[PDB]
């Protein structure tokens, strides 16, 4: 571990800066479950006699 970490030629700030940057760093969001929220996702439609026999 220790000697492998110090002798690893891959590791380094210079190597990290040599490599490029991906677009997932600058992507923003995926707000699908706030874009569509009025529409029911359970699919359990509330029925008339359930409402009446309850409330």
């Amino acid at each position: 571990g220790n000697e492998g970490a110090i002798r690893d030629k891959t590791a380094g700030r210079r190597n990290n800066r040599s490599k490029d940057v991906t677009d997932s760093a600058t992507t923003k969001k995926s707000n699908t479950r706030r874009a569509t929220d009025r529409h029911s996702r359970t699919g359990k439609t509330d029925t008339k006699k359930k409402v009446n026999q309850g409330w």
Binding site: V51, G54, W55
Partner: protein, 80 residues
């Protein structure tokens, strides 16, 4: 031992006690009375016992998955 003594009282004006009304409606809903039935029972009980305003806001799910809250109001209620 002996430095605290409990005592009891009937509560005068037992009708116009909000915690008593909430306890009574806990009892009736545990018995299985209808929400509409029992809640009107409390609102008319408070108004006949002699308060100036009453409301009950039972709220939750009863038989449907969706939860609503229907408000039984009768009398005059300040709010601020």
């Amino acid at each position: 031992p002996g430095t605290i003594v409990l005592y009891a009282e009937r509560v005068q004006d037992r009708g116009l006690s909000a915690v008593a009304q909430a306890e009574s409606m806990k009892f009736k809903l545990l018995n299985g009375l209808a929400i509409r039935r029992a809640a009107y029972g409390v609102v008319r009980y408070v108004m006949e016992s002699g308060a100036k305003g009453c409301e009950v806001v039972v709220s939750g799910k009863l038989r449907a998955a969706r939860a609503k809250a229907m408000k039984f109001a009768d009398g005059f209620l300040i709010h601020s």
